[PDB]
Write a protein that binds this ligand. Structure first.
Ligand SMILES: *SCCCCCCC(=O)NO
Ligand SMILES: [Zn+2]
Length: 423
């Protein structure tokens, strides 16, 4: 089976269904951009993100006031039709690489089922969608139609290497932290990757290493998808909750703090830096939020719109949050099933676990220091494949992660900027 059933070309004609010009609602005035629906509830926009934030409507570098040492700027990237064509084929290839593993098939399944909650109504008895969880699709007659969706993969903004999740908020609800969920816009590029060091002492030192080994972009995309899974189920930890690193002398010499959301997303040894009493506080919180979702679904006898029934809409949220249906017809939250789903989204879907499935070399911890950024081209099968990534089987790159070795497989990587020593 395949996740993306159509090998899209960027120059394919629009059809108003899965190849169409779309608009982002409630952003500011924008021109419709060509988008591609690679899967149910998942779209891809091969353009630089100058929309989701009215602040960053400029691809040129800002005045170095809030600028990061780990940054890279190129206003011309992803501006030609050939670039957008390779971007679409690159993102397509990475989704199939993730889907080729059991862990990736489970994560992508949970993302599709993670429909943002229909809690937009100010009247308790009526269920209504939240407007900022859809896009406007131009139909073959020039008219717009709204279509719900969970995920959007879009190009980066001014800083090319800052892959960030972006979602539209609410002045009444924290949709990413109240269990509701929201449509997630992921800034990502398959044409760049980062270099890391193979020894833990060198990788976690800010003064050593040039980035001998390159990160598999499938791991990078999965890492962002894990964040999107947390936000689509509304169980993301507030970024204010941080772990002030005491395990790295260079971190505390500058007072660097890392959010619990990042430590949870990486998994492995990093996840246990979140102490057990605070993790219990988080789980009880999201458990309560799930019951109010069960309560508002119980106090709902109506629905707004003619695109779905109330029984279907009550059903899809029962499948999403794994609620229990009693004999009276009202939903409840089983603690055993909540702990089951919460652990799947937080402990099973981790970067460290995806490394084990991909059989790749990767950073051992989120508490390291970036080394370099490379330009890559994963679309040609002679460079990168679904089942092997860079470590192509039956070649000299198969063993010892030789494909990720930028000194052995030098023709596949072009170093653009060094980060070592600039801290
Ligand atoms: S959608 C992810 C929310 C936090 C953005 C930080 C970028 C990141 O994930 N770095 O590893
Ligand atoms: Zn992250």
């Amino acid at each position: 089976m395949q996740f993306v059933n159509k090998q899209f070309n960027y120059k394919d004609p629009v059809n108003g269904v899965d190849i169409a010009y779309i608009k982002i609602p409630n952003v500011g005035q924008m021109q419709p951009v060509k988008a591609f629906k690679i899967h149910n509830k998942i779209w891809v926009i091969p353009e630089r993100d100058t929309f989701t934030n009215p602040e960053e409507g400029d691809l040129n570098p800002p005045p170095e006031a809030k600028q990061v040492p780990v940054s890279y700027y190129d206003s011309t990237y992803l501006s030609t039709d050939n670039e957008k064509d390779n971007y679409l084929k690159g993102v397509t290839k990475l989704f199939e690489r993730i889907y080729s593993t059991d862990l990736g098939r489970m994560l992508l399944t949970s993302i599709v089922r993670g429909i943002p909650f229909w809690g937009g109504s100010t009247i308790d008895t009526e269920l209504k969608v939240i407007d900022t969880n859809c896009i406007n699709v131009i139909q073959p007659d020039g008219s717009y139609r709204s279509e719900e969706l969970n995920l959007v993969i879009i190009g980066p903004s001014a800083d090319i290497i800052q892959f960030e999740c972006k979602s539209f908020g609410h002045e009444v609800l924290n949709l990413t932290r109240n269990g509701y969920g929201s449509t997630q816009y992921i800034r990502f590029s398959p044409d760049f990757t980062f270099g890391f060091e193979e020894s833990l002492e060198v990788d976690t030192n800010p003064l050593l290493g040039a980035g001998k080994f390159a990160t598999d972009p499938a791991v990078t995309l999965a890492h962002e998808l894990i964040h999107a899974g947390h936000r689509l189920y509304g169980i993301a930890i507030n970024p204010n909750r941080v772990f002030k690193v005491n395990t790295n002398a260079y971190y505390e010499m500058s007072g660097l703090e890392v959010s619990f959301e990042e430590l949870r997303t990486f998994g492995g040894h990093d996840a246990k830096f979140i102490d057990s009493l605070q993790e219990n506080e988080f789980r009880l919180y999201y458990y309560n939020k799930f019951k109010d979702i069960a309560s508002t679904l119980n106090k709902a006898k109506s629905i707004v719109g003619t695109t779905a029934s109330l029984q279907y809409m009550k059903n899809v949220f029962k499948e999403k949050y794994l609620l229990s249906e009693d004999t009276s017809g009202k939903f409840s939250v089983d603690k055993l099933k909540f702990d089951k789903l919460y652990k799947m989204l937080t402990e099973i879907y981790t970067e460290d676990n995806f490394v084990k499935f991909f059989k790749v070399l990767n950073r051992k911890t989120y508490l390291n220091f970036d080394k370099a950024v490379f330009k890559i081209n994963i679309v040609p099968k002679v460079n990168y494949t679904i089942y092997d990534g860079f470590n192509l089987r039956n070649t000299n790159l198969a063993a010892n992660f030789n494909g990720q070795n930028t000194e052995i497989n030098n023709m596949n990587f072009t170093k653009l900027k060094n980060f070592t020593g600039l801290f």
